[PDB]
Structure 1
Amino acid sequence: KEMPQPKTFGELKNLPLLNTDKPVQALMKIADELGEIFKFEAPGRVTRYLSSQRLIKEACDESRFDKNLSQALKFCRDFAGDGLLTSWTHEKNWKKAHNILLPSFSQQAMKGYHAMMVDIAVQLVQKWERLNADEHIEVPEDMTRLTLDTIGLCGFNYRFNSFYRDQPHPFITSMVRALDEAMNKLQRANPDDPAYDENKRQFQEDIKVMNDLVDKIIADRKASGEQSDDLLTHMLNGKDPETGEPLDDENIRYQIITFLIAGHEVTSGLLSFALYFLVKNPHVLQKAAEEAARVLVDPVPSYKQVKQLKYVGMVLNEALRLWPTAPAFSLYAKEDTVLGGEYPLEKGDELMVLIPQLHRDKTIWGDDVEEFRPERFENPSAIPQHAFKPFGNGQRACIGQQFALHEATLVLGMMLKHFDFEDHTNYELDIKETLTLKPEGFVVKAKSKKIPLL
């Protein structure tokens, strides 16, 4: 089969199609028009966007396809280095850091992070308890305060103290600005044109800000000798069972930067979309709130109680189905191969997995794919293979999946226990796009149930 291709712009091919505020949503509309696979060309680039479970289940065959660095991840590598997210599978530091960090991200390690997650979650609840009568909540903003502070505390015992600020910590300002520059660079045809000399100069300044703080944090920890229950301690002490080597200080820095750029935005986006769908579906909200009240019987949630928030977990998965906050990942063919019995690929050919469109495959989910129904996730065995991929695939899947879902389940559970929520503006979903997706301008009012935290 000849695969379809969206409209072209002469020598720029398809590139101008991504010169828009909402490129993922533009790609979703193209998939609606062209189907499960389309070619996408830019100067010096060819890829193929996949949208059907039928083809993506083959793309997830690790014997045939390996992780590719998208252009987006290639530009993030300028500050995330050879951290886990922006490393090639064949780089020595990927397998080393992977082996060392897996035990630090397990479901069992969440038991040790739980107290620190509760610390920040309680700060969120207390902020909302302290709002005056007809004040409102800026949801994505507060969720980002929470996830940034949680990763900072669990990552390297550092308090960004985001709930004490209107202006973010200087590291966060530089990180956000570096991510924005990485995403903006996806359109420039003459990078060395002197017109962008200021962007380049600003980009380097933000990189130095992040490195200096993280390098200082590492140096301070080695100088104090203190042992915490954070990822930094595990990385200073861990040894790769395979090579027997530890991570060096440079790679440890890249991992810390990666944890912050990799998990803060996708996780706050998940919480924001989850709360959005809950207030738009009051029957679902009531069911989730009933579970929270039944399970969270103590002033502070325990680790075990979070595991019992089954329906809250399904709410989070259904929010990830409709709006997976990490919207795509990239693959390359390890050898010549045929995709779906119709599209021959040569060794090295690239694929993009368009996750929000995969999750709308009506052959998998039925005709009501746009409806928010957490009950779809009652039984993981009922879900066909590779139909649900918000955390990527295989050995290159999200190492932070357990962390993100424990944090989100804890916080969402506490939110549902302590407040009733009002969609007081009848908010119209508007999805802002960066590296990730989030509902911009989403606001609610939260009326306290007056349940103490002591």
Structure 2
Amino acid sequence: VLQDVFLDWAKKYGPVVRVNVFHKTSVIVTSPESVKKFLMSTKYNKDSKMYRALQTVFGERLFGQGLVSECNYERWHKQRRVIDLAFSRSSLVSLMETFNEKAEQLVEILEAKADGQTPVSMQDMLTYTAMDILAKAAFGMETSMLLGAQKPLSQAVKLMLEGITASRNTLAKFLPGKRKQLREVRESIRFLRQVGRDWVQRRREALKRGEEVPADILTQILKAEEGAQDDEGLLDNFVTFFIAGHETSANHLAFTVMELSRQPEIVARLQAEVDEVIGSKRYLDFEDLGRLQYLSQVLKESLRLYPPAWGTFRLLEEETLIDGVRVPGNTPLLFSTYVMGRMDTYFEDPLTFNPDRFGPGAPKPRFTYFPFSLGHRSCIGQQFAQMEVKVVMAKLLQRLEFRLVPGQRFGLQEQATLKPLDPVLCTLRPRGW
């Protein structure tokens, strides 16, 4: 686990460490003051030379110049301003029905298997859940993965994210069947962009027949592409949203369930809170979410130890002194919430999963914790995701208990994002016996 090697190095060699595992020499920077300086100013922008790995994968255009991978400030800001409209408080409030719907479908599907005996991959079920939410919420589409459909589509995502991590030259070293990987990954990326054309087409047709579709992310990514010569920019945003809008939430759900399977005390307390704030309501209202304070803590603590988005890069344009170390200009700086969250200098007993760290009255972590990143390039979807995941967790806590199958490991793996090494295979029982 490469991130653990970074952690080791940050601990042993200081807040600024030169690394060589990527195609360009980079430096990992782990003091909270440098985080503040570089992430909190629009003077510092993403390094396009690192972001090319998302832009294009094995030669095949993927994220392109969409909202995540465009690094130029002006070009980024023009699109960010348009797309922000799909994330207003009212927009998000109007997604509650979709969150509630898909979370309820997941729960019923799990309860149907809850005989303490049938193994279910919670990683897969949570990815199906997150994908059906995103497709419906952002694009008006029903993927129905919870109901067994669109398997090829989640496959294609897995292949291409594997591809991104595999592209690392120091890792993309010397094995034989790198040829098959290339074709499968290229083919997956083309598949996904074609899905995109189909879905955009659907929307365009609806509009031509005079339907009034409520404005969603799709509306705004179309709006951001008005004067375009072709649809490539549009499809870059489709891919951006499709992936960024479900993969990280699915990873974060899967980590949280995996970790809770060994935290019976925390679980009991989550269950009490659920019963208390939502009782036996079937659906959550938006006001309910704010009261799931303890669940909120658990989710936060889950992101400290297990941040799916584990790093971000900024271009250091000119030679500069950083925590005492001279860093050459034109150097990619890596900031890692994964690393900092596991340093005992920033967190006491860092490997202990302790939700009280985010308890009320506790001081907020100060530039040592950023699972949605910070500053102008922080996650546009943070509130959407925090809503989404509390809805899913609250529903599960209300109705089900999980036992991890013996032999399942607690480890992580990097496939672009971090996610559980194992599929979080569980057996399930209805809550209470």
Q: TM-score, normalised by structure 1?
A: 0.84
d(CA) in 1 for partners of 2:121 and 2:141? 24
2:356 equivalent to 1:370: no
The amino acid across from 1:148 in the alignment is M
* Residue among 29, 34, 37 paired with 2:13: 34
d(CA) in 1 for partners of 2:269 and 2:114? 27
d(CA) in 2 for partners of 1:229 and 1:97? 16
2:410 equivalent to 1:429: yes
d(CA) in 1 for partners of 2:161 and 2:258? 25
Partner of 1:322: 305
Partner of 1:233: 219
Deviation at 1:81, TM superposition (A): 1.0
For residues 87-236 of structure 1, the aligned pairs below 5 Å read: 87-90=70-73, 92=75, 94-133=76-115, 134-165=117-148, 168-187=150-169, 199-225=181-207, 226=211, 227-236=213-222
d(CA) in 2 for partners of 1:68 and 1:263? 22
- The answer as to whether partners of 1:52 and 1:361 remain within 8 angstroms in 2 is no
Q: TM-score, normalised by structure 2?
A: 0.88
2:375 equivalent to 1:389: no
- The answer as to whether partners of 2:3 and 2:339 remain within 8 angstroms in 1 is no
Secondary structure of 2:8 counterpart:
helix
Distance change (3 Å), C-alpha of 1:43 and 1:148? closer
Distance change (3 Å), C-alpha of 1:198 and 1:150? same
2:263 equivalent to 1:313: no
d(CA) in 2 for partners of 1:334 and 1:57? 17
- Aligned-pair Cα RMSD in Å: 2.9
Deviation at 1:50, TM superposition (A): 2.3
Percentage of pairs with the same residue: 21
- The answer as to whether partners of 1:152 and 1:160 remain within 8 angstroms in 2 is yes
Partner of 1:49: 28
Q: How many residues align?
A: 420
Query: For residues 120-154 of structure 1, what are the alpha-carbon distances to aligned partners after superposition, in whole Å with 9 as ceiling and x for unaligned?
Result: 11111011110151213311111111111111111
Deviation at 1:202, TM superposition (A): 3.9
Query: For residues 315-374 of structure 1, what are the alpha-carbon distances to aligned partners after superposition, in whole Å with 9 as ceiling and x for unaligned?
Result: 10000001111111111124443212x0123432221112211112323322x2211111
The amino acid across from 2:375 in the alignment is G
* Residue among 265, 269, 276 paired with 1:283: 265
Partner of 1:12: none
Partner of 1:416: 397
- The answer as to whether partners of 1:174 and 1:210 remain within 8 angstroms in 2 is yes
The amino acid across from 1:215 in the alignment is R
Query: For residues 9-43 of structure 1, what are the alpha-carbon distances to aligned partners after superposition, in whole Å with 9 as ceiling and x for unaligned?
Result: xxxxxxxxxxxxx3223333333443433111258
- The answer as to whether partners of 1:361 and 1:369 remain within 8 angstroms in 2 is yes
Distance change (3 Å), C-alpha of 1:386 and 1:286? same
2:51 equivalent to 1:68: no
- The 4+ residue runs of structure 1 with deviation greater than 6 A are 188-191, 244-248
Query: For residues 365-401 of structure 1, what are the alpha-carbon distances to aligned partners after superposition, in whole Å with 9 as ceiling and x for unaligned?
Result: 22x2211111211348822431211111211011111
d(CA) in 2 for partners of 1:198 and 1:445? 35
Deviation at 1:198, TM superposition (A): 5.1
Deviation at 1:422, TM superposition (A): 2.9
Partner of 1:251: 233
Deviation at 1:403, TM superposition (A): 1.2
Deviation at 1:46, TM superposition (A): 1.1
- The answer as to whether partners of 2:255 and 2:306 remain within 8 angstroms in 1 is yes
The amino acid across from 1:147 in the alignment is A
* Residue among 60, 83, 91 paired with 2:66: 83
The amino acid across from 1:257 in the alignment is V
Distance change (3 Å), C-alpha of 1:362 and 1:64? farther
Distance change (3 Å), C-alpha of 1:96 and 1:290? same
Partner of 2:315: 332
- The answer as to whether partners of 2:102 and 2:129 remain within 8 angstroms in 1 is yes
Deviation at 1:163, TM superposition (A): 1.7
d(CA) in 2 for partners of 1:146 and 1:44? 35
- Structure 1, unaligned stretches of length 5 or more? 1-21
- The answer as to whether partners of 2:11 and 2:343 remain within 8 angstroms in 1 is no
- The answer as to whether partners of 2:124 and 2:423 remain within 8 angstroms in 1 is no
- The answer as to whether partners of 1:53 and 1:361 remain within 8 angstroms in 2 is no
Secondary structure of 1:363 counterpart:
coil
d(CA) in 2 for partners of 1:353 and 1:177? 26
Partner of 2:388: 407
- The answer as to whether partners of 2:54 and 2:69 remain within 8 angstroms in 1 is no
The amino acid across from 2:38 in the alignment is A
d(CA) in 1 for partners of 2:177 and 2:120? 40
Deviation at 1:200, TM superposition (A): 4.3
The amino acid across from 1:355 in the alignment is T
Distance change (3 Å), C-alpha of 1:34 and 1:168? farther
The amino acid across from 1:150 in the alignment is I
Distance change (3 Å), C-alpha of 1:338 and 1:111? same
- The answer as to whether partners of 1:107 and 1:402 remain within 8 angstroms in 2 is no
Secondary structure of 1:65 counterpart:
coil
Distance change (3 Å), C-alpha of 1:196 and 1:315? closer
d(CA) in 1 for partners of 2:364 and 2:92? 26
Deviation at 1:313, TM superposition (A): 1.0
Deviation at 1:75, TM superposition (A): 4.0
Partner of 2:340: 358
- The answer as to whether partners of 1:72 and 1:183 remain within 8 angstroms in 2 is no
Distance change (3 Å), C-alpha of 1:379 and 1:245? farther
Distance change (3 Å), C-alpha of 1:276 and 1:201? closer
